[model samples]
Target: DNLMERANSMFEPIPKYPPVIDGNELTQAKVELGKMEFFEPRLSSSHLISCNTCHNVGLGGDDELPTSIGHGWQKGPRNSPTVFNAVFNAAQFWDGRAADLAEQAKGPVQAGVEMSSTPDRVVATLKSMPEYIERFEDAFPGQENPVTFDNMAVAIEAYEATLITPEAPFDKYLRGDTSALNESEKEGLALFMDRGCTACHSGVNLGGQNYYPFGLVAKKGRFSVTETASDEYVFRASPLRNIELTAPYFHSGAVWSLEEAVAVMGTAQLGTELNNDEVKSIVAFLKTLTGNVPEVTYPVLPPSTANTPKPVDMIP
Candidate 1:
């Protein structure tokens, strides 16, 4: 009971999924329009592949692959992270390069290997759609011309900010429902704190709030990337919410088994080689982090006109 109380002291309960994006007050029209864009393949140079291509809303906001298949059937270098509850992340992307969702939204659209579309091309494609002409006006009121690249990112950001998973077992436990967690998970929780895991994983998102050295006990391994020698090993303690749905784990997505991943973290980050039973207990605790996946109605995008750009079939 005392340990449980300490666990409670270190962690704050997750508040109602995503909080508001600082400047982007949501509107029905904005979300709906962004919804369409999220699935709008025309925004890319290809008539195929939207934001949902990698971050499938229907599938825990990811394609569930070690890495995403991008334009031209090429694979991205890093694992595609979940878009679920992504707005809660202090910064977007695996490297934490983008400051916010809005900025992150813009990259893939123009990435040479991802969406493979240009700003001018995206503008032209949306403008070609008479339906988009009307929808954009509604999403961004008072704009004479609304089908710009920035507006596309803005609308997507508004919609993504709403993509928060709520009500995990841990959340319920945090709310004073003891039955929400079993004895093993409770034990794992005690170890997680006493073992010093909470030094980085204690916030509402249980790790997204800050960056930490990926392999504190040793050199950084495959999943996380590093640039300069001193800071290269550091990566954001990825959010634990809805973690079960998004795998394989790590920056490289090399680890598939959650138990194995837990063991690796114990050794790599803490320099403690946890036994098999301990790894299982920690994983059982992690299973409680799985939360609600929001239902997303697949948006029916506007018909692409003949003038709209066509999907480029992949080479090789």
Candidate 2:
């Protein structure tokens, strides 16, 4: 069993499209807690932002802005990356800053611009609520007190892990259904591999497995805000899954049209300009990556009591 299975696993490590991300067993109870945690506005200083604020599941897991506007209406430097099929990425964030979802979950809540929240602040807010405390016990059994900063991240990570979009047209085509892709999409696929897009956009997620400078062949400004000498211009390629829905492409969210973006990528990254027809074919193929978004019922949050930390409205 080990001999062949291990050998095959090496060849097809991520054998399945939309691979499941199971951390802390990812039970229903944890997911339930996580759902509330993810959508809970009270986690933020202004009691207005949550994981969903940026990565809205209803809208292809992105806020659809050029960049995210967070606490106090402060706009982030880069656009919000989608959460759908995120676990498939080797790391998280545009810069691949956080190694995994759990680490990535912690940043926004504490960032002055994002949530502007502290760990103590988040803990006190949750601990103040009887509803959350009760749910935490169920989610993580045997804890005298399970409502913790780390556990909140765990629950949120668990919830996010379940956020995979499966059964795309491309996935079906890979499953040996030749009819899954039409002639145009097939032609686009051929061009994608034959052209140099596959050099960076291969693997299960079709991107995110590797990192490259924003403009590999041509240098561009503000390719990264955190640009160092070695890592300057480096950014993770946006995953092509659900590419149609995730418009306003690239980290800057500068380009809106997928065709235009395809053309830009050809010139900027590949150093080869694609004609109108090639761009159209590639855009058509990219559209096939859109799968069904996960249906999420909005969780009814625990109402804030008199003693609970009120939503802070700071003057900008």
Candidate 3:
């Protein structure tokens, strides 16, 4: 009960789903269109990578790679963050570059090394498919031209917003089921808060609410975004929802072992070297955060028409 009380003050349960965006209502038609777009590889210049390539909904919303493989088999600069519960994030991306998921969806599509397709190219591709045009019209009723890039991103945002995980043992405990976590997990939960991990890792998503530098005790490359020297190596603290499923840890994706990652963070962030047993204790609690993944059926995309642009090999 004491441990639960401590955690209650710091963390929150993930809501069943996110609220609708002010301008973009969460209609079934829009969500369905977005699901198609999320799985639409044709949006990429290579016609091989969709948002699902990096953020696989089945795999805790992250590609299980140190860095995601992007256009031309190029390795992305940072690890792909899990898309589950991202709607709870204060801002999008590790660097907090995009204001929201809608804006965030457009970046990788045209990032040269990611999907490597321009908005004009994407709109043209969507227009080539009669089914897509009709779906977009239905999704965005009243808009004369509903197949634009922004609308596509909006639709994707609507779908992505629903990618939440709830009913974890930890969430059950938070909701007043005291037996949800066992004694060891309860001890670990206490350590999680008392040991100072909760400083940056709190809130509904348990970390995405704020930005922190990589090596606080030991690291800034974000100067490009903020132009402030302090912004260098700064990144948004990642959310911990379904953490047991999404790994390896951190922005680098270097540590595959959950306990090892916990130990490393113990030193790098908190300046404390946790013993092996303590590490295990904390990891047990972390595993309790694993939640139920929402079932998302793969959408059947329409066939491309003769007018659709052919896939281009960016490197060769």
Candidate 4:
């Protein structure tokens, strides 16, 4: 009870994903269109990779790769983070490059190693599919030209915002069901908070609300965005929900074992070499962060029309 009370003080229980994001209502038309857009591989240069390729809704929202292989089999610099509950994140991506879901949705589409397609090409592709054109019109009712790239991001945001997972054991414990967590998990929870892990890992998503230098104790980071010397090795504290499923760990995706990751964090960030038992206990607690993934119906993308540009090996 005391631990629950303390945890309640530090962390807010994750609520169900709402039908709105940033005050934009997630109407059925918008969400449905967005779902199609998310599943549409034609948006990529190769016409084989969609948002689902890396951020699969069924696989804890990640591709389980150290770094995602994208267009031309090029590997991205950082591990792809989970999309589940990402709407609660302060900003999107490991370095917090994008301001919101919509902005974040645009990054991979144009990244040379990722989707590798231009916004104009994406708009043209959507315009070529009569079904998609009609769906876009329905999603953005008032716009004369509804199939724009911006609207594509908007629709994807609407759908992605609904990908929240709730009711994990830790969440139930936080909600006052003291029996939700077993004794070992409870011990792990206590250790997680008492051992200074809560310094950066505190929040509704257990992290992701703010940026922190990745290696505070020993340290891919925010330097690119701000260009300050100190920011060079800084990174947004990763949100830990469903962490068990979204590994290989860290920005480098080097750590595969959760226990090892805990040990590494203990040494790197907290300046302590966690013993085996301590790592085990903390790993037990981290597993409780896994929650119920929403069931997503796979969307059938409309057939590409003759006007649609054929897939190419490279955009340039």
| TM-score for each model | 0.83, 0.81, 0.85, 0.85
> Considering TM-score, which of the candidate structures 2 and 4 is the better prediction for this target?
4
Q: Which 10 successive residues of model 1 have the least lDDT summed?
A: 105-114
Query: Which regions of candidate 2 are displaced past 4 Å?
Result: 1-23, 68-76, 95-115, 216-231, 268-273
Better of 3 and 4 by lDDT: 3
Candidate lDDT scores, in order, read 0.69, 0.68, 0.74, 0.73
Top lDDT prediction, candidate number: 3
| Residue-by-residue lDDT tens digits, candidate 3, 206-230 | 7877655553221211111122245
State the lDDT of candidate 1 residue by residue for 1-316, as single tens digits: 6765776788766566356665777899988888887887776654666778888877767766654455433445666767777776674344433333344332221332234567788888889889988999999899988888888777777788777777889878887888899999998887777666777677666776765545322242433222325554445676766778877666666666676667666654354456678778878888898777777888877877888877777764
Candidate 2: worst 10 consecutive residues by lDDT? Answer: 4-13
Residue 196, candidate 1: Cα error in Å is 1.2
Off by over 4 Å in 4: 68-76, 95-115, 215-231, 268-273, 314-316
lDDT of 3: 0.74
Q: Please say which candidate is ahead in TM-score: 1 or 3.
A: 3
Model 2 Cα lDDT, one tens digit per residue, 160-246: 767777778877776556788798997787777657786667666677666565532223232222233455435676667788888
Worst 10 residues of 4 by lDDT: 216-225
| Backbone clashes, candidate 4 | 1
TM-score: which is higher, 2 or 3?
Answer: 3
Residue 204 error, candidate 1, Å: 1.8
